[PDB]
């Protein structure tokens, strides 16, 4: 059924976006707790559910890049290095390419060795769909975080 699902999502958006202080650590695990299902529900089998929690994921991204950018692309990576379903891995994956031009000087290094390894096992997948939103997204990730690669990581991209 969608409705529960739909208003679940609603609820949990509705109330993280509101909130004002945006900055405690139990703000941060009801925020990862987000992440994972708006991730999870990008997969479901109700259309309904994967178009609310997608446009949930665009709300609360754009209520917090003030604010907790060190933590959405970080929840972002978590489903990504799950090599998991399509639909939430394609999720993950587009969204962690727009926000890759944000990220600190400070932590490119860490990020390019932490998603060659994603990057080379999302590359060998079957799925068309995961294929074309990789297209996107390597372009995006690569004119971010190129400059911080060693000769031999490029060699093995």
């Not at 972002?76 to 962690?96: H, Q, V």
């Not at 995006?140 to 400059?147: E, H, P, T, V, Y």
Request: with cysteine; aromatic share 6%.
């Amino acid at each position: 059924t969608k409705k529960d699902r739909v208003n679940h999502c609603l609820t949990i958006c509705e109330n993280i976006v509101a909130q004002s202080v945006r900055n405690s650590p139990e703000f941060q695990k009801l925020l990862g707790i987000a992440m994972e299902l708006f991730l999870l529900c990008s997969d479901d089998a109700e259309s309904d559910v994967r178009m609310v929690a997608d446009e949930c994921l665009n709300k609360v991204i754009k209520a917090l890049m003030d604010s907790n950018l060190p933590r959405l692309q970080l929840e972002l990576y978590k489903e990504i290095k799950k090599n998991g379903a399509p639909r939430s891995l394609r999720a993950a994956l587009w969204r962690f390419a727009e926000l890759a031009h944000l990220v600190r000087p400070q932590k490119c290094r860490p990020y390019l060795v932490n998603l060659l390894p994603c990057l080379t096992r999302t590359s060998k997948r079957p799925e068309e769909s995961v294929q074309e939103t990789l297209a996107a997204a390597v372009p995006k990730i690569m004119a971010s975080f190129g400059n911080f690669a060693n000769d031999n990581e490029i060699k093995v991209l």
